[PDB]
Design an enzyme around this catalytic site. Structure first.
Site, PDB file in Angstrom:
ATOM      1  N   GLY A 109       2.916   2.363  10.688  1.00  0.00           N
ATOM      2  CA  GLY A 109       3.289   3.367  10.764  1.00  0.00           C
ATOM      3  C   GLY A 109       4.385   4.080  11.827  1.00  0.00           C
ATOM      4  O   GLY A 109       5.050   4.670  11.990  1.00  0.00           O
ATOM      5  N   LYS A 122      -0.063   4.520  -0.623  1.00  0.00           N
ATOM      6  CA  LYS A 122       0.019   5.550   0.500  1.00  0.00           C
ATOM      7  C   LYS A 122      -0.319   6.652  -0.173  1.00  0.00           C
ATOM      8  O   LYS A 122      -0.786   6.737  -1.764  1.00  0.00           O
ATOM      9  CB  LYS A 122       0.248   5.716   2.125  1.00  0.00           C
ATOM     10  CG  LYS A 122      -0.618   4.068   2.695  1.00  0.00           C
ATOM     11  CD  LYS A 122      -0.556   4.284   4.057  1.00  0.00           C
ATOM     12  CE  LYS A 122      -0.537   3.390   4.830  1.00  0.00           C
ATOM     13  NZ  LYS A 122      -0.070   2.952   6.500  1.00  0.00           N
ATOM     14  N   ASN A 148       0.433  -1.521   0.194  1.00  0.00           N
ATOM     15  CA  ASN A 148      -0.096  -0.127   0.170  1.00  0.00           C
ATOM     16  C   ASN A 148       1.300   0.856   0.031  1.00  0.00           C
ATOM     17  O   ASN A 148       1.253   1.558   0.930  1.00  0.00           O
ATOM     18  CB  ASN A 148      -1.194   0.215   1.102  1.00  0.00           C
ATOM     19  CG  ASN A 148      -2.466   0.949   1.291  1.00  0.00           C
ATOM     20  OD1 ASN A 148      -2.042   1.809   0.480  1.00  0.00           O
ATOM     21  ND2 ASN A 148      -2.804   1.336   2.069  1.00  0.00           N
ATOM     22  N   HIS A 199      -9.765   0.193   5.318  1.00  0.00           N
ATOM     23  CA  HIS A 199      -8.016   0.376   5.719  1.00  0.00           C
ATOM     24  C   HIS A 199      -8.145   1.558   7.143  1.00  0.00           C
ATOM     25  O   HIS A 199      -9.485   2.225   7.697  1.00  0.00           O
ATOM     26  CB  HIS A 199      -7.155   0.996   4.796  1.00  0.00           C
ATOM     27  CG  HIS A 199      -6.255   0.945   5.654  1.00  0.00           C
ATOM     28  ND1 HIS A 199      -5.182   2.267   5.697  1.00  0.00           N
ATOM     29  CD2 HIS A 199      -4.205   0.069   5.284  1.00  0.00           C
ATOM     30  CE1 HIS A 199      -4.088   2.153   6.409  1.00  0.00           C
ATOM     31  NE2 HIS A 199      -3.739   0.713   5.449  1.00  0.00           N
ATOM     32  N   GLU A 216      -4.506  -5.224  11.192  1.00  0.00           N
ATOM     33  CA  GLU A 216      -3.191  -4.524  10.412  1.00  0.00           C
ATOM     34  C   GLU A 216      -4.220  -3.904  12.087  1.00  0.00           C
ATOM     35  O   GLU A 216      -4.814  -3.179  11.821  1.00  0.00           O
ATOM     36  CB  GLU A 216      -3.376  -3.629   9.555  1.00  0.00           C
ATOM     37  CG  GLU A 216      -3.245  -4.423   8.503  1.00  0.00           C
ATOM     38  CD  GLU A 216      -2.912  -3.471   7.700  1.00  0.00           C
ATOM     39  OE1 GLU A 216      -1.466  -2.756   6.844  1.00  0.00           O
ATOM     40  OE2 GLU A 216      -3.719  -2.413   6.473  1.00  0.00           O
ATOM     41  N   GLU A 251      -6.578   4.468   8.200  1.00  0.00           N
ATOM     42  CA  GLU A 251      -6.306   5.826   7.821  1.00  0.00           C
ATOM     43  C   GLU A 251      -7.747   5.740   7.337  1.00  0.00           C
ATOM     44  O   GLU A 251      -9.033   6.581   7.625  1.00  0.00           O
ATOM     45  CB  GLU A 251      -6.129   6.083   7.097  1.00  0.00           C
ATOM     46  CG  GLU A 251      -4.627   5.820   7.256  1.00  0.00           C
ATOM     47  CD  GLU A 251      -3.091   5.344   6.274  1.00  0.00           C
ATOM     48  OE1 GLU A 251      -3.494   5.155   5.629  1.00  0.00           O
ATOM     49  OE2 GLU A 251      -2.208   4.588   7.236  1.00  0.00           O
ATOM     50  N   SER A 303       4.241  -2.116  10.478  1.00  0.00           N
ATOM     51  CA  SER A 303       5.659  -1.599  10.435  1.00  0.00           C
ATOM     52  C   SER A 303       5.835  -3.170  10.091  1.00  0.00           C
ATOM     53  O   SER A 303       7.610  -4.140  10.901  1.00  0.00           O
ATOM     54  CB  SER A 303       5.784  -2.087  11.554  1.00  0.00           C
ATOM     55  OG  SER A 303       5.515  -0.032  12.005  1.00  0.00           O
TER      56      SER A 303
END
EC number: 5.3.1.1
Lengths: 245, 245
Positions: B168, B10, B8, B92, B162, B94, B208
């Site tokens: 991140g 992003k 991804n 996701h 996740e 985000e 990560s």
């Protein structure tokens, strides 16, 4: 003040149908002093800028507020310029009221887009319940301020007044109704920024603008053009570009 | 079950840097038994599919829940297909926690994406406060259920666990934390869908994932691959694809 017409294609089109749309625009007789901008879906921005005549601008329909980072699904001004487009539409009613975008977030997007060298079509507008309670002005003033606090240079900003109840409903604001809001908005810019900014800043109307109703709206003193949704996907987008001719 | 690695990107890249990223991936010695998919920003999806070798999949990073309509800033599965891409990342972290996407909205997106012929990487995961309160299982089961309720055929679905605290942050799940969850998710698929779907559905870990930690994560019985963020932008994405050899 140059007459301005944006076409917001929203979530419509594929390469074939947008190719035909663009081809018709490219070969159409357009009043030379209409500034025309087409807002294409993000997935077709590159395609649209390659195919559209260079004198017709291209806008992203939204962007985020930093150049890069962990924001799955977002695009930045840096990406939009990389593709050759020079505009973005920010604070659209659908972003605010379907996707919960706040005044704060929109103001941040405006500040970033402008610093990155994009132009912004910044949208404001009241809901029906707000109109009926009599707050139209307080609502658009609050939204405009949250934009204006983040505009250092108005050269590349166009304000777009679109009543929420007019978007996609077939119920456009009357010429009088639009004129009174546009007039008040221009008076706001005069009082809060400067006289030079009030007299040079385009305030465009949107909300069910058609070939049949555009002439009467555009002859209003403080209406400077249009943001056009549904009819931007149709041949009559040409008549709206030519609303004053 | 075939090992699956999604990258991804992003909100990162321009034509030049992604063109370089793509060129390296195209040329890299990639384990032929890894299914590989790259999630490109929407503005570059068309470019990405032209440039990436056909054996590497392309995913949109998000989409909406109808083919067309008045949804400024959104793209549809029909647009994703038109551009030649066959995947989409949905739900996701985000989208959920920066942009407020609800379980019901993600569910409707999942149904629509699959009905239109796309594959879906469906993301789930608990936040730090939720893990610390002993509630991880409840949160991911609820999230997984909202996805499962809108899946008729699991063939083209990959589930991606996740945990939000790992995305991140540089603070990966340990192999044991991840296994404990994947194992529970698979048991959920067994009890609430079918044994066949439990043994055939890839459940990949994200948060990560790096070259240095991927081998120990992949050897856990119920980790079937990865959704990779920041390391998808680097040469070590190759090593993650090769985690089993």
């Amino acid at each position: 003040r140059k007459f301005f017409v944006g076409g917001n294609w929203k979530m419509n089109g594929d390469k074939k149908s947008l190719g035909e749309l663009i081809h018709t625009l490219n070969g159409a007789k357009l009043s030379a002093d209409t500034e025309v901008v087409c807002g294409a879906p993000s997935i077709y921005l590159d395609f649209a800028r390659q195919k559209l005549d260079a004198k017709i601008g291209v806008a992203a329909q939204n962007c985020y507020k930093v150049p890069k980072g962990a924001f799955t699904g977002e695009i930045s001004p840096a990406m939009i310029k990389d593709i050759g487009a020079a505009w973005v539409i920010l604070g659209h009613s659908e972003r605010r009221h379907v996707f919960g975008e706040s005044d704060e977030l929109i103001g941040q997007k405006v500040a970033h887009a402008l610093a990155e060298g994009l132009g912004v079509i910044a949208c404001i507008g009241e809901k029906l319940d707000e109109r009926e309670a009599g707050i139209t002005e307080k609502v658009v003033f609050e939204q405009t301020k949250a934009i204006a606090d983040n505009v250092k240079d108005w050269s590349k900003v166009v304000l777009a007044y679109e009543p929420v109840w007019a978007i996609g409903t077939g119920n456009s604001s009357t010429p009088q109704q639009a004129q009174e809001v546009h007039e008040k908005l221009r008076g706001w810019l005069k009082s809060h920024v400067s006289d030079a900014v009030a007299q040079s800043t385009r305030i465009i109307y949107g909300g069910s603008v058609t070939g049949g109703n555009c002439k009467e709206l555009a002859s209003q003193h403080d209406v400077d053009g249009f943001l056009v949704g549904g009819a931007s996907l149709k041949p009559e987008f040409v008549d709206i570009i030519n609303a004053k001719h």
